[PDB]
């Protein structure tokens, strides 16, 4: 079935970090997975990643640093509107000095710190810290 593709991509990344692996393969690939990985890599929680291209949905190989502590998904994509955001990042995040919430806004997939910097709400996807 695989209702949600991002959920199992993130759970398979997170099951390997607990194990000390240097790399993972995750499949199928998707547009939202690549954007979420780019957001997670711009900050420095993962290394580079490579996309393997079959003529189907494809597969990704990720180089894992040892910096990632936990990444995860919020199961229904709730609407979040720049006033709920503080009450959201007081449940999901472990502190006020690190850890990011990832949300899709009409200006792309980004983090909360940029969402407030651009005055935009959207839908929550997940978090990593």
């Amino acid at each position: 079935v695989r209702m949600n593709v991002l959920a199992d991509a993130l759970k398979s990344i997170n099951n390997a970090e607990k194990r000390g692996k240097r790399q993972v393969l995750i499949r199928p690939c998707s547009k939202v997975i690549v954007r979420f990985l780019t957001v997670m890599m711009k900050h420095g929680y993962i290394g580079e990643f490579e996309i393997i291209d079959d003529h189907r949905a494809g597969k990704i190989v990720v180089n894992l640093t040892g910096r990632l502590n936990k990444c995860g998904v919020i199961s229904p994509r709730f609407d979040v509107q720049l006033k709920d955001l503080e009450k959201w990042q007081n449940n999901l995040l472990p502190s006020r000095q690190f850890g990011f919430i990832v949300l899709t806004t009409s200006a792309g997939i980004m983090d909360h710190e940029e969402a407030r910097r651009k005055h935009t709400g959207g839908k929550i996807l997940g978090f990593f810290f």
Binding site: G20, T65, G66, R67
Partner: protein, 83 residues
């Protein structure tokens, strides 16, 4: 760890494992600090300078420090290549 003035307010900076990047706690009585020697490149005799490696207790308990030191050495000219 610093503050807005700039000083460092911290008891100590714990070391991190060289194979999994996770810090080594203060009560991990299974972590080691293996120290290997450097040779003098001509007659193959020891000369002072040496290399040091830390391995955490967990990955030492799963039987993986063996093939992790081999990789930390091969990456670093103690073994060069062609193991």
């Amino acid at each position: 760890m610093q503050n807005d003035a700039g000083e460092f307010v911290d008891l100590y900076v714990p070391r991190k494992c060289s194979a999994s990047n996770r810090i080594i706690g203060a009560k991990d009585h299974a972590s080691i600090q293996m120290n290997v020697a450097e040779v003098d490149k001509v007659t193959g005799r020891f000369n002072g300078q040496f290399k040091t490696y830390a391995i955490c207790g967990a990955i030492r308990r799963m039987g993986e420090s063996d093939d992790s030191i081999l990789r930390l050495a091969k990456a670093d000219g103690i073994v060069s290549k062609n193991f």
